[PDB]
Tab-separated table of C-alpha atoms in Angstrom:
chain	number	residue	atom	x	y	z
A	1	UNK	CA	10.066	15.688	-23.066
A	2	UNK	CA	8.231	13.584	-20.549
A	3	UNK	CA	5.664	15.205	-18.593
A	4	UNK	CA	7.444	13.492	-15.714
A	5	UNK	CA	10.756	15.016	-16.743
A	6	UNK	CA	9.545	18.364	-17.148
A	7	UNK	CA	7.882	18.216	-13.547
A	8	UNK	CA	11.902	17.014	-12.435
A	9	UNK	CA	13.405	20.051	-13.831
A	10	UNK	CA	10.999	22.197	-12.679
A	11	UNK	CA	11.721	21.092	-9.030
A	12	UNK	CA	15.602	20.251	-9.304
A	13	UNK	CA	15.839	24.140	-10.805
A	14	UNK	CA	13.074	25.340	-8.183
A	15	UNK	CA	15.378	23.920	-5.092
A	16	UNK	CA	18.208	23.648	-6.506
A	17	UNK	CA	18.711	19.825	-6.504
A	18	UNK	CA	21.002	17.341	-8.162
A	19	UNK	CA	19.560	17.377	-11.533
A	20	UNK	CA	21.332	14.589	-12.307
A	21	UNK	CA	20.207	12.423	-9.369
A	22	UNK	CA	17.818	9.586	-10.228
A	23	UNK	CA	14.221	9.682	-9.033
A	24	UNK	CA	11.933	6.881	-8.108
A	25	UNK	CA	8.537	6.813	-8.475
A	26	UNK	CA	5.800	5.182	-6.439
A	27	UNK	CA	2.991	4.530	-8.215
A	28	UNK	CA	-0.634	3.998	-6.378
A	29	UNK	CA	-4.071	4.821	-5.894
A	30	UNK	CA	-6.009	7.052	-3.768
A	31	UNK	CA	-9.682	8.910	-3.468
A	32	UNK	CA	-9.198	12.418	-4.345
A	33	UNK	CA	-11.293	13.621	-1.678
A	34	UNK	CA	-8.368	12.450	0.779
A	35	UNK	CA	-5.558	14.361	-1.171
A	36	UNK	CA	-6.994	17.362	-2.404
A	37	UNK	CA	-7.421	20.497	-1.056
A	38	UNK	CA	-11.586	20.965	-0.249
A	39	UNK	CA	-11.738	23.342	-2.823
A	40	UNK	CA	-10.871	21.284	-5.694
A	41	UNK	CA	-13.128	18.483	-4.364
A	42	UNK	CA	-16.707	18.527	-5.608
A	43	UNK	CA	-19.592	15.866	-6.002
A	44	UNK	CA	-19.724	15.343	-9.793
A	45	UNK	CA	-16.545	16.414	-10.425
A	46	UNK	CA	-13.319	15.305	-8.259
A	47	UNK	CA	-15.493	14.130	-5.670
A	48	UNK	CA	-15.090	10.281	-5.183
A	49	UNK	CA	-12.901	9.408	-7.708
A	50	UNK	CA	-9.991	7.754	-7.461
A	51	UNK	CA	-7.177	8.850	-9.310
A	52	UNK	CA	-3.897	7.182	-10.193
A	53	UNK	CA	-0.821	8.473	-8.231
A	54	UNK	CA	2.404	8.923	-9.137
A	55	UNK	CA	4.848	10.162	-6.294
A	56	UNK	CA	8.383	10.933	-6.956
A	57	UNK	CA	11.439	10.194	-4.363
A	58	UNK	CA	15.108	10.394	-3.837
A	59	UNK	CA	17.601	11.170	-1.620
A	60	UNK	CA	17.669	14.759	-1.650
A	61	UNK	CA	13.821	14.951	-2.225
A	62	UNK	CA	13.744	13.159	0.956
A	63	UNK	CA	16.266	15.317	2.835
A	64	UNK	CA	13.899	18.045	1.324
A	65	UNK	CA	10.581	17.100	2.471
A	66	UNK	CA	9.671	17.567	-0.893
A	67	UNK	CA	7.327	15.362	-2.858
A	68	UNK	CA	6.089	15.912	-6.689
A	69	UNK	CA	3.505	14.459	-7.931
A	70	UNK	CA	1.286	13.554	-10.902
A	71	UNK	CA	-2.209	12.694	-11.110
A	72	UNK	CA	-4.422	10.833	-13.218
A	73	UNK	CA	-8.095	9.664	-13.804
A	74	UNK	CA	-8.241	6.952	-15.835
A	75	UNK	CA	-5.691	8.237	-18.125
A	76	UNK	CA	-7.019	11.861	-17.952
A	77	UNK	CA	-4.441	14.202	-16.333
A	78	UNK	CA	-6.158	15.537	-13.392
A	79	UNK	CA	-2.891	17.760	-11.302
A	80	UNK	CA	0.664	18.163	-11.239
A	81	UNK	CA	2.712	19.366	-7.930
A	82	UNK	CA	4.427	19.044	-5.396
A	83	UNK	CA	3.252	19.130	-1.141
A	84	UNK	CA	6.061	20.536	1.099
A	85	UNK	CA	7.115	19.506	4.352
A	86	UNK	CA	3.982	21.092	6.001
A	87	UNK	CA	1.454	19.936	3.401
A	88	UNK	CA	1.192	22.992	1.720
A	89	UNK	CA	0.247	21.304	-1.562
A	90	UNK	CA	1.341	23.602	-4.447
A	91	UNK	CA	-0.069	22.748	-8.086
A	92	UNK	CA	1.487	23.563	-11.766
A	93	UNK	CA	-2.226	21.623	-12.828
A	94	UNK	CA	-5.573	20.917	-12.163
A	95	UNK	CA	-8.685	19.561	-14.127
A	96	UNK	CA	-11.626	18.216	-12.601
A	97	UNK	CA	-12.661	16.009	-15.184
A	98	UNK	CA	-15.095	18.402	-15.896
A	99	UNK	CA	-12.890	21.250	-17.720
A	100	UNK	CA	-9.462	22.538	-16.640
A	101	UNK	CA	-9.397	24.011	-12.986
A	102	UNK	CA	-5.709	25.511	-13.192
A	103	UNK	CA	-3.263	24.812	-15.906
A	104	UNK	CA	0.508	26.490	-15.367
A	105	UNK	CA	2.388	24.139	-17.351
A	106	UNK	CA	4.119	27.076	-19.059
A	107	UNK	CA	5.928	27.352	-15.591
A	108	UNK	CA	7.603	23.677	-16.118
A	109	UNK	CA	9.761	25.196	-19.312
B	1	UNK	CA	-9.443	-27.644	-7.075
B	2	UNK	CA	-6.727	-29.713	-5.088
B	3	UNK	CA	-5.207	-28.602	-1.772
B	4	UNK	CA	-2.601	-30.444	-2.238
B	5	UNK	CA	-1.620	-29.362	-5.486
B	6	UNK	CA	-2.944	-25.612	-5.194
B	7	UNK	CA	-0.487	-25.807	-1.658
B	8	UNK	CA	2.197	-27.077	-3.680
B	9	UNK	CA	1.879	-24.301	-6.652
B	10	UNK	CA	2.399	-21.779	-4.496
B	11	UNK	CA	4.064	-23.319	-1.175
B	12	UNK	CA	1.739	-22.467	1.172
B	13	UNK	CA	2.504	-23.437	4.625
B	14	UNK	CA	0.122	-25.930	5.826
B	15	UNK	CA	-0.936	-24.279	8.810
B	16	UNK	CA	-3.169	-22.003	6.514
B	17	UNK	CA	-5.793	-25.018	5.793
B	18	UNK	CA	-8.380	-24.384	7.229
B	19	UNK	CA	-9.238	-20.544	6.524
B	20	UNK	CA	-7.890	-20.943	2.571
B	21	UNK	CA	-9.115	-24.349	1.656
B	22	UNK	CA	-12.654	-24.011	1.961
B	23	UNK	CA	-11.736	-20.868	-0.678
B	24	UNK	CA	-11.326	-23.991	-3.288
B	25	UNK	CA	-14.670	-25.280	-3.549
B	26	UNK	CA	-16.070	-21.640	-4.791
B	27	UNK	CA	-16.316	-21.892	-8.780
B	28	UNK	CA	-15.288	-17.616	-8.518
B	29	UNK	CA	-11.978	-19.185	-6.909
B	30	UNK	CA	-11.409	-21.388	-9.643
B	31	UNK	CA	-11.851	-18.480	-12.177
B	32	UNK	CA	-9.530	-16.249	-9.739
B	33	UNK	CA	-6.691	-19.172	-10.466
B	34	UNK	CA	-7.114	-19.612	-14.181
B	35	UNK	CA	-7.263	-15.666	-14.590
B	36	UNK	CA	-4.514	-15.147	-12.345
B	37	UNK	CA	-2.418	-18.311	-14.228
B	38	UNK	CA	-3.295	-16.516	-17.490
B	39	UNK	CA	-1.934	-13.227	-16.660
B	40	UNK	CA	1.035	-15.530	-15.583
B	41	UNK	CA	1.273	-16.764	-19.263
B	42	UNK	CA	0.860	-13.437	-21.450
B	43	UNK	CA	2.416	-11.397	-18.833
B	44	UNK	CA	5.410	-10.388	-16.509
B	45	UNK	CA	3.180	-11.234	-13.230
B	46	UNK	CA	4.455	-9.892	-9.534
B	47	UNK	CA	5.765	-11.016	-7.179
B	48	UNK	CA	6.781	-14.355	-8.313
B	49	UNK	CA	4.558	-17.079	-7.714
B	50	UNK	CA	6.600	-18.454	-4.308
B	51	UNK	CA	6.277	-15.213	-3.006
B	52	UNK	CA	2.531	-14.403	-3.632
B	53	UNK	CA	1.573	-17.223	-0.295
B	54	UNK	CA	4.592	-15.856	1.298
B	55	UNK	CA	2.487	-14.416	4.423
B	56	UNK	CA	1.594	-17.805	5.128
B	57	UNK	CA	4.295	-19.361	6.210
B	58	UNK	CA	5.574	-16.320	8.421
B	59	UNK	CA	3.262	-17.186	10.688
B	60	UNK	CA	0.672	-19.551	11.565
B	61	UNK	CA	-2.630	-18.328	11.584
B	62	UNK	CA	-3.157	-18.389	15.912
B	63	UNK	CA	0.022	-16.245	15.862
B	64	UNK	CA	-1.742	-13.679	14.251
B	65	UNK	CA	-2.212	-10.514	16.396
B	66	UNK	CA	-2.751	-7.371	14.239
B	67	UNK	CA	-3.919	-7.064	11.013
B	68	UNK	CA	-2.513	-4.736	8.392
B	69	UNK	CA	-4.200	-3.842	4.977
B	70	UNK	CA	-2.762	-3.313	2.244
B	71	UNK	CA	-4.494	-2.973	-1.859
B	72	UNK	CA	-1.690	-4.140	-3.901
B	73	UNK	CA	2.060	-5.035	-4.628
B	74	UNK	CA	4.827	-3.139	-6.063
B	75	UNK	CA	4.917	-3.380	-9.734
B	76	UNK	CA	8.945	-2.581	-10.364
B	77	UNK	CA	10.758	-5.981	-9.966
B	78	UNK	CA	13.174	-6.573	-6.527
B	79	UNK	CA	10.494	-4.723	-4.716
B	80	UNK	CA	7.186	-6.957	-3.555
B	81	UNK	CA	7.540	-10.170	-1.939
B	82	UNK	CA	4.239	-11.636	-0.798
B	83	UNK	CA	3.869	-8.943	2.197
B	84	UNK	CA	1.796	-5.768	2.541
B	85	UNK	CA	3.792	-2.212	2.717
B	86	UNK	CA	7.180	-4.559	3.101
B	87	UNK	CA	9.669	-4.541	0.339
B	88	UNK	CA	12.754	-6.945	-0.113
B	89	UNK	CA	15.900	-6.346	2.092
B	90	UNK	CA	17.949	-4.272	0.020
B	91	UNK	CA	15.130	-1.416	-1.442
B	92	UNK	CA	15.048	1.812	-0.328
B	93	UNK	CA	11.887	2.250	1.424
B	94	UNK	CA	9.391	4.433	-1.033
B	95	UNK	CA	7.315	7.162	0.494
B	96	UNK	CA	4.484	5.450	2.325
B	97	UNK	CA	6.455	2.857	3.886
B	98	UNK	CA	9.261	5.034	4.851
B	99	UNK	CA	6.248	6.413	6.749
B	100	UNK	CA	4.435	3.777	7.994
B	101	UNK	CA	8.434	3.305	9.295
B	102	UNK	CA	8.377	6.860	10.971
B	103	UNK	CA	5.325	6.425	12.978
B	104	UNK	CA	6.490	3.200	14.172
B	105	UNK	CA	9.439	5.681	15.109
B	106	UNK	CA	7.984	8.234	16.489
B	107	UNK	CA	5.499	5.903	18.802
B	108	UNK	CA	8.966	3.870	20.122
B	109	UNK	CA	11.628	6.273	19.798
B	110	UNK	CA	13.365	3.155	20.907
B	111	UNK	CA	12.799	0.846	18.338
B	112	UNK	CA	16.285	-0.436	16.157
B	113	UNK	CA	15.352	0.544	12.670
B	114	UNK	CA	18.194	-0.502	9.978
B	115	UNK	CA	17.083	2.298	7.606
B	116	UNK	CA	15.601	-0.929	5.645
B	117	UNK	CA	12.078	-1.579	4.612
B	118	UNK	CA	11.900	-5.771	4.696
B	119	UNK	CA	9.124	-6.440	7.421
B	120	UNK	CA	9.721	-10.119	7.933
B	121	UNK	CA	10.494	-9.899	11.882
B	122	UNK	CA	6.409	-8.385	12.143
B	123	UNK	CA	5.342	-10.836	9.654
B	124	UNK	CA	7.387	-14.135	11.999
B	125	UNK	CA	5.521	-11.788	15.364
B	126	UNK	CA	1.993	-11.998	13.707
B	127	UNK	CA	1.623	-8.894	11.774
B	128	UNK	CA	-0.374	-9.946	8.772
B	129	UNK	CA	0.109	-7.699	6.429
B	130	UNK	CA	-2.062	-8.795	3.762
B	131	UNK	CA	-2.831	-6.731	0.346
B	132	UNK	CA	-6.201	-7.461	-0.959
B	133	UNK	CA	-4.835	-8.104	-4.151
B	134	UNK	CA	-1.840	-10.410	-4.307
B	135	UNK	CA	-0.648	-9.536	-8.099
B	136	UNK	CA	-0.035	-7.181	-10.518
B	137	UNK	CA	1.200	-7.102	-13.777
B	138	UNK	CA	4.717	-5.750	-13.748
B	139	UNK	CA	4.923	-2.120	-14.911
B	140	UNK	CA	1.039	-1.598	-14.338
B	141	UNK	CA	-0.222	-0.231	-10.677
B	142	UNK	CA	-3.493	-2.325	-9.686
B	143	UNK	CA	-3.330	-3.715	-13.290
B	144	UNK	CA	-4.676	-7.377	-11.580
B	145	UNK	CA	-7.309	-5.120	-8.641
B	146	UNK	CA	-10.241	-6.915	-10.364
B	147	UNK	CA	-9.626	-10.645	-11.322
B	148	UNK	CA	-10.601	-11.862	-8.198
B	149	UNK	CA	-8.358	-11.401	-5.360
B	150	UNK	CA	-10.281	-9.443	-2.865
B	151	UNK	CA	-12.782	-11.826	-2.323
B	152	UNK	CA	-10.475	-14.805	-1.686
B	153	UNK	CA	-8.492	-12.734	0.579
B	154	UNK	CA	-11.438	-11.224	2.509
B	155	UNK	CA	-12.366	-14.973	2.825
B	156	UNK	CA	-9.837	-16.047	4.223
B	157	UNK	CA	-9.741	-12.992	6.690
B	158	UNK	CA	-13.554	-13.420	7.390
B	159	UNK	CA	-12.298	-16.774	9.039
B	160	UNK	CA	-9.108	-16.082	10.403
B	161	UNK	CA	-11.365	-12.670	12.374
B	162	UNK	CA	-14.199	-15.175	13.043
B	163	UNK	CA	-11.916	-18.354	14.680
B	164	UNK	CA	-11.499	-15.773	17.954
B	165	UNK	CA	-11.887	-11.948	18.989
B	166	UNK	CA	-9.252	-9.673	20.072
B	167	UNK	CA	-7.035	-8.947	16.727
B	168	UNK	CA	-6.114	-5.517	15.914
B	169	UNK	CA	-6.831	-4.745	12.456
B	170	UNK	CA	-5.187	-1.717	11.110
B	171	UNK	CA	-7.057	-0.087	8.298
B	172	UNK	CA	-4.801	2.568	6.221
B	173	UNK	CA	-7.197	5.023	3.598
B	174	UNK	CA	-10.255	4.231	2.334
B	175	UNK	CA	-9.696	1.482	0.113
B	176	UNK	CA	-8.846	-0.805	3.744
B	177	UNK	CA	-11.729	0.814	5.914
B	178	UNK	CA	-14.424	-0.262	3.258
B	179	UNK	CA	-12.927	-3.273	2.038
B	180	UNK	CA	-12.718	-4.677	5.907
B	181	UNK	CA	-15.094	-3.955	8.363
B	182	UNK	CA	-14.569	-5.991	11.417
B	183	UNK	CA	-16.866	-6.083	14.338
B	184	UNK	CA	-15.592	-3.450	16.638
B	185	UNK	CA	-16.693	-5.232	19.665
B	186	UNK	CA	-14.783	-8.260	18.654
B	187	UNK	CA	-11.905	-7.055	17.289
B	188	UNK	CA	-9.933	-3.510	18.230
B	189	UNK	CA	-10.633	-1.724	14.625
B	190	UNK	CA	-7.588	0.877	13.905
B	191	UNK	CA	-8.500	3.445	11.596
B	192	UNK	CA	-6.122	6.375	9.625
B	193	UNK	CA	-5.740	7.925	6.543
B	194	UNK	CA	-3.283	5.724	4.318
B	195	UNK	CA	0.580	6.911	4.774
B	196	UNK	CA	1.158	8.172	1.143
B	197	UNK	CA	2.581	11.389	1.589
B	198	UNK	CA	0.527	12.304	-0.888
B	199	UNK	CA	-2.393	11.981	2.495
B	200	UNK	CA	-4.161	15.351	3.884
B	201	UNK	CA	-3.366	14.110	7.404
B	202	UNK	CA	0.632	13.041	7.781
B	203	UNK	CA	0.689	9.636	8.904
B	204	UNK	CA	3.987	10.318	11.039
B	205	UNK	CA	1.432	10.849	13.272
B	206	UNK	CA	-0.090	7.711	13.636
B	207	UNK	CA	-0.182	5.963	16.798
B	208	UNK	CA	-1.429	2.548	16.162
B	209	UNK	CA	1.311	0.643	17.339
B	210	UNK	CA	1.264	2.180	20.442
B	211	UNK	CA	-2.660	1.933	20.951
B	212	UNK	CA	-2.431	-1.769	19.572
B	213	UNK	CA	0.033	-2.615	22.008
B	214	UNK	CA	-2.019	-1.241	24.916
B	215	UNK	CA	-5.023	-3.031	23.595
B	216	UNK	CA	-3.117	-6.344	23.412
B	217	UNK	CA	-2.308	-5.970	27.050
B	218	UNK	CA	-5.517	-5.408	28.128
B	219	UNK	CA	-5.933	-9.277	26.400
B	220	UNK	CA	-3.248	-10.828	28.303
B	221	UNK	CA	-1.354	-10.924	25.153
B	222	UNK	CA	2.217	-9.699	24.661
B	223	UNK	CA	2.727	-6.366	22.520
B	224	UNK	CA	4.560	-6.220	19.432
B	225	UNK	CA	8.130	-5.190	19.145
B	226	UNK	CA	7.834	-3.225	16.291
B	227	UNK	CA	11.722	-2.757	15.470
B	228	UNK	CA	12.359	-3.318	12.221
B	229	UNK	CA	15.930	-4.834	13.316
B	230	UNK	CA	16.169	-8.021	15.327
């Protein structure tokens, strides 16, 4: 199973959404200094790199506030999550191209 | 290189000239082309090659009164059409423009949005809204960032700035507020964080078409009506 599927189920089962409805994804790219939190933002590690975004949509995700998403570094995996409607970014994953920060994956089942 | 014939390739609107022209006598523009006509050869290449000029003939360039940066297009066919942010008429906004959308909102509670994400009404008022690269490979986010592009574009928006004072430029994330740096005395610079949702700082919060509008006022020129429906 995708990693992308995996993070769907997780959040259709977490909020109880369509499972069924399609998702879009927009794709783009971003310094991670100006998405994560400070704490997972050092120089050498996180610190001015710019990852590859992936940010998932739909109807009901919109009606939700609710926005998963999957990062990357040049192919490295750096977070899965999802930020709520008051930016309270919640992560599943998190490596800092260093070693891994945070890795609940087992929660996606 | 040919005007005429690079004009025709891409049907630019002739009123372009004279800030894209002198582009064609730089050997690094030449290279841009070829690169950029390869990709078109092995590759699915976005948006299609009518649409990658399409900001020029919105608007001439002395219509031009704000300035809006964008890096590159969407990759997923139907979607891109030669503008920054914009997508074609019948695409659901995605998550940054349904933003950039809500600020516009929230600073005119006013303004006659369809629900739709095509920006061509801004684009015919003189909102450039110009990525600083024009392709991409379909499939492949910022797959074409570093053929070329960004050099020919900030050309041609070196002159455009330079021909008189008093645009707005507004510059979304970091990638816009390094890769433009107007003369704030000259120009009214507009700075934010980009509107991904994925930003620290919501950009629902954004107020630069309000503060542009005052600013244009201020310069005896007349603010944009930033409804997205005629």
């Amino acid at each position: 199973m995708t990693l992308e599927l995996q993070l769907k189920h997780y959040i259709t089962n977490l909020f109880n959404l369509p499972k069924d409805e399609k998702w879009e994804c927009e794709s783009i790219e971003e310094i991670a200094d100006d998405i994560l939190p400070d704490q997972y933002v050092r120089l050498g590690a996180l610190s001015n790199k710019i990852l590859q975004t992936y940010t998932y949509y739909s109807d009901t995700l919109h009606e939700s506030n609710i926005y998963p998403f999957i990062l990357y570094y040049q192919k490295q995996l750096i977070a899965i999550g999802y930020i709520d409607e008051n930016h309270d970014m919640d992560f599943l994953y998190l490596h800092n191209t260093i070693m891994p920060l945070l890795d609940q994956r087992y929660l996606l089942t | 290189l040919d005007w005429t014939t690079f004009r025709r390739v891409f049907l630019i609107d002739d009123a372009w000239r004279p800030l894209m022209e002198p582009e064609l006598a730089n050997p690094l523009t030449a290279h841009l082309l070829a690169e950029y006509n390869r990709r078109c050869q092995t590759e699915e290449v976005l948006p299609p090659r009518e649409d990658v000029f399409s900001w020029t003939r919105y608007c001439t360039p002395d219509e031009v009164r704000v300035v809006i940066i964008g890096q590159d297009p969407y990759h997923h066919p139907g979607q891109a059409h030669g503008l920054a942010f914009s997508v074609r008429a019948n695409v659901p906004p995605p998550p940054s423009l349904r933003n950039v959308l809500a600020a516009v909102k929230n600073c005119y509670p006013e303004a006659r949005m369809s629900g739709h994400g095509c920006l061509e009404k801004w684009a015919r008022d003189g909102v450039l809204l110009l990525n600083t690269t024009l392709t991409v490979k379909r499939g492949a986010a910022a797959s074409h960032s570093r053929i070329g592009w960004d050099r020919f574009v900030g050309g041609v928006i070196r002159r455009l700035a330079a021909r008189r004072p008093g645009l707005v430029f507004m510059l979304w994330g970091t990638h816009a507020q390094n890769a433009i740096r107007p003369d704030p005395r000259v120009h009214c610079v507009l700075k934010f964080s980009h509107p991904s949702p994925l930003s620290k700082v919501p950009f629902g919060t954004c107020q630069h078409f309000l503060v542009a509008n005052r600013y244009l006022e201020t310069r005896s020129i007349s603010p944009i009506d930033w409804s997205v429906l005629e």
